[PDB]
Amino acid sequence: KHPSGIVPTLQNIVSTVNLDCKLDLKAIALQARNAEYNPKRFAAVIMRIREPKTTALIFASGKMVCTGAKSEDFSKMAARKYARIVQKLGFPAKFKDFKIQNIVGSCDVKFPIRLEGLAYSHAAFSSYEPELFPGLIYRMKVPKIVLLIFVSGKIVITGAKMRDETYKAFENIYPVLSEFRKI
DNA sequence: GCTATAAAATGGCA
C-alpha cells in the first residue's frame, strides 16, 4: 500500500478515553509526582510518564487526552497507565470509549519541491504564504487530510484517525510532488 | 524560541 516505496513515520498520536468518574484535580496534583495543575491556565492536570513517553491532560469530568505516543498501541498503553495512576490515587477509574483522535506522520521524498508551482496548479487545496509560514498547506479532500509540504522535500501529514489515511494521503500526493520537483 | 497544521479535552468571556 506504499507504491512510492516510502512509508511515512508516525510521530505523534492524540487519543482520548473516559475514566468514567469525576476527578478531584487538586487532590491529584497534590498527590501525584510529575503532575502540574494551574486552573487559571487550563482546566486539566498535566501529567507525564516516561514510557511510552507521553503527556496526559486529565479533566474533572473524568475524560483524558493522551498525547505524544509514536503509535496507536503506544498511545493506548500510555492511557491505560494514566488510568492506573489515577486509580492508585483513589479514584475508581475505568477505561471507556478509548479512541484515536489524531495521527501525525512525516516523511522525506529526498528531492526539492517547487511550492509556488504546486500551489498555483492546485489552488483549491493549497495555501502558500511563505512570509507567514515556510510550508505549503495542502488540504486534501479524499482522504480529508492536511499535508505541510516544504521546499526540502520534507512532508508532514496530519489529521488522520487511522494510519491508512496518512498513507493514502502521502501516496496521493507523491506523483504531484514529482511533477513539481525543483530542477 | 515563534510562525502554521491537525485533534481532543474544558473553562472563561464578548
Added chain:
DNA sequence: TGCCATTTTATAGC
C-alpha cells in the same frame, strides 16, 4: 455561543 487558553509532533524561515 465562537474563540481564546494547553498539550503533542514533524517541518523551516524568521
